[PDB]
Symmetry: C5
Subunit: 208 residues, 5 copies
């Protein structure tokens, strides 16, 4: 009869925060979805935008699974005690500013969810933000050091209201957000690196 | 009997900072209460405010309980030695800047009080701030990863002077502050997350 | 004899940085005095000031005492190795920017001295800063979690020249500084908290 | 027949982060290559630029080698666990801001690859940035404390688009980039510190 | 013979980062020399300047000495493994932004050198910066907690051009640098603290 103190204790034993949990010989499947919450400073001259969003991130780590028959099925764990994808926004020009406690949710079957609220500035296409069609800023997120055979990233395919959580007090409004996937092979290495491109179509409110 | 050294030593032995102190199978009852100290910046156009407040937070942790029979009934302890509610302001657009020493007060009975002074920026309704009826900025604070069955949040209905500790030198003045309990559900999970909605009715000071 | 290394080793053995060193069952007498070095960014419209000052702090911790008959009677020690009063400036709107090496000076009898040069911004009365009588900004500094029975704060009775170390290059000049003691009771607790009130009377320099 | 866990373990076990991994008695051969991603802010009056670039850095540490016949021959490793070249931009006027996860890639032969995306400000010739011939900002990168006998610096001679990864939304465009091997010496001593001079020839984009 | 790893281990096993390396009861003789690299933000209205310099620091700890007849004569060591002078710029109004890897150089005879490149804002006489005679900004640096009998600082009146490494791209030029020494007693203690005062004579570069 283990409690929550036991679950965390035995997770610290099996978990290796620096060892990607590749099962057999397959890549770790990381799903990523960006819940846009706000759009702050926007500079059409420099093509920069300050965005706030909840980066819903999920994956499975079997080395964490336990028996939930006489124990809770889920627990909150500091991410510093788990392995986490080394995701990076390729066109970000400031490091990600995490606004929420850095805790992930771990399910007895090894499923992991981490959804930090992040504030980050980006280099993207802002032109057209003050027009009916709006501007389309594309955000590219993917593993920085794990190629396609170690980590694959796919947008959590779930038809959701693009502005379900978007602040109603923002000067901007979201016209549409589309998430796509891509595989790129750089110089350094022969293997491909997967990324997800989130396109944020938005414009200023109250235009003539 | 014992001294402050023993109390902290003991807290050190039984305290589990990363384990939510749920006694039995019910949620930890956390009380939240904001005391507004200042309103530094307000933007009528972007609907943004920069404020300073004391986030009075209390909860119970049985494991820390000790007999004050012949020793102090209270000690100041670094929050890094205790478990703390993973509270977050859902509409905040900046990381919380804790202006005070990160020490919590622990009562011999396991009661915990943590009151950090915090400066933080929020996205909220600033319209009407320049009028007699002022503006109403609602700030939502609740656990980030613990749903209703693990954490409950309720305000401290201590009907006091909303501007009791408010700075007299601020450019704004407080008209009224009300704290309402609120529940919310999201995608990830079926169970809802509780939060305390703080309505700050304030306006600019002056004639006209 | 004994060397500075021995002194530091033993200090580290007896020092309980997280335990207030109360003698008998009395409060630790903490002396606080400010030496103003500069006045940087004044704003009479927002009633905010950016100030640089030396926070001369002294207290006693007998549990760090040693025999200096054949050894040195003083050593510099990192503050992390010592218990330090959890002092806070009640009307500060930015956390303190400690500009100096965080080392405290310890005497063999247990007297501790810690004097960091601090740059911090405050919310205070800036009205009249550009008039002959200048403005009077009052700074309140005291323990954040230790009430009167645990910590007592008193302004060092000394009387250095108010602007003896104040930069001659500031746009402003000090007209007078008075540091008075004070006590305050809150909503959380029946026992009061002590604080020193420092009144900085200053003005922008004239011309001719 | 060892998995990634054993590999990383071994690496954390034999790696000496503070000891230069000198093979026999020849300097450590470090290769440095900059891949400009953006030119954020430019000032022709103060000869100062703000640029983002991927700093491709490679070297060898034979002690980390492991038999990958029946095991992975490449793992991601926290640079904190490894010895890393103490490279510095000699004409940088700001601390390098690493925007990406600080992980290096280690091959089973001891080859170490580290490519952090960095944002940093430099003091360099910006004159002509607004002409068809644009400006030429030269950035010097080399070891800060290891002269030529301890560390050698060489540009990863690899033909490729000078702006293959440069932002298309930037306000500037890259005309050419030449990375030349070179060295620096100081009065005091005969010691010679090798570096890589990266010539960034760019100009303001024409709105046409 | 001994390799670099053996040299480090010996250093780590005898150097005491928190213990000043005093000889008998003689004060540690520290050498300070500033090599200006740039003069960035300059404000004659507020008398503030942003300066980038190499803070060449020298001292010795003979207990770290080894035989280099058949072993390296020098090694780079993280300053966190060494005792380092607690130097502070008295008229600095910003904490130092260390731009270079924080590694020192220890020589086999016990000498230790540390040359961090630093950017710091100073409060000093900026008046006359736009004239032929320019301005004279005096920078004062010395130990913060070690008086004259524990540490003595001396300006290396070595032969070297003032703007030998000074940037050509700065909006200013150096006219003459002179280093003097001083000793001061403060309202806290009886013993005096030494310091080196650097007078930087610079002016706005003009086509005259
Ligand atoms: O949108 N969601 O699915 C969920 C949430 N949005 C804001 C807080 N929230 C709850 C939550 C659940 C799991 C984790 Cl790891 N972090 C936060
Ligand atoms: O408002 N209050 O109830 C109490 C306080 N306000 C400012 C300092 N203060 C004292 C205090 C007590 C306990 C804790 Cl945990 N922190 C601060
Ligand atoms: O540009 N490149 O050559 C390579 C890359 N650019 C972005 C991610 N990427 C992959 C990568 C591989 C190993 C390391 Cl150490 N860092 C990054
Ligand atoms: O001026 N010098 O003699 C030497 C140097 N100036 C800038 C870097 N540099 C090399 C150097 C030497 C010793 C140390 Cl400890 N750090 C850097
Ligand atoms: O003003 N004073 O009394 C003393 C000082 N002012 C600047 C440096 N200084 C010396 C000093 C002594 C002890 C400690 Cl703990 N810190 C600084």
């Amino acid at each position: 009869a283990a409690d929550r103190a036991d679950i965390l204790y035995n997770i610290r034993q099996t978990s290796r925060p620096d060892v990607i949990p590749t099962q057999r010989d397959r890549p770790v499947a990381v799903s990523v979805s960006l819940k846009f919450i706000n759009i702050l400073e926007v500079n059409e001259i420099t093509n920069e935008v300050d965005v706030v969003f909840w980066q819903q991130t999920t994956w499975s780590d079997r080395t964490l699974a336990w028996d939930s028959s006489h124990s809770p099925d889920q627990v909150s764990v500091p991410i510093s005690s788990l392995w986490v994808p080394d995701l990076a926004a390729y066109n970000a020009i400031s490091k990600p500013e995490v606004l929420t406690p850095q805790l992930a949710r771990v399910v007895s079957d090894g499923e992991v969810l981490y959804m930090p609220s992040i504030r980050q500035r980006f280099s993207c296409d802002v032109s057209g933000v003050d027009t009916e069609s709006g501007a389309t800023c594309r955000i590219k997120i993917g593993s920085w050091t794990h190629h396609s055979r170690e980590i694959s990233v796919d947008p959590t395919t779930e038809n959701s209201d693009d502005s379900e959580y978007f602040s109603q007090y923002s000067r901007f409004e979201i016209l549409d957000v589309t998430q796509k996937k891509n595989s790129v092979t750089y110089s350094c290495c022969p293997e491909a690196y997967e990324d997800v491109e989130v396109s944020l179509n938005f414009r200023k409110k109250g235009r003539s």
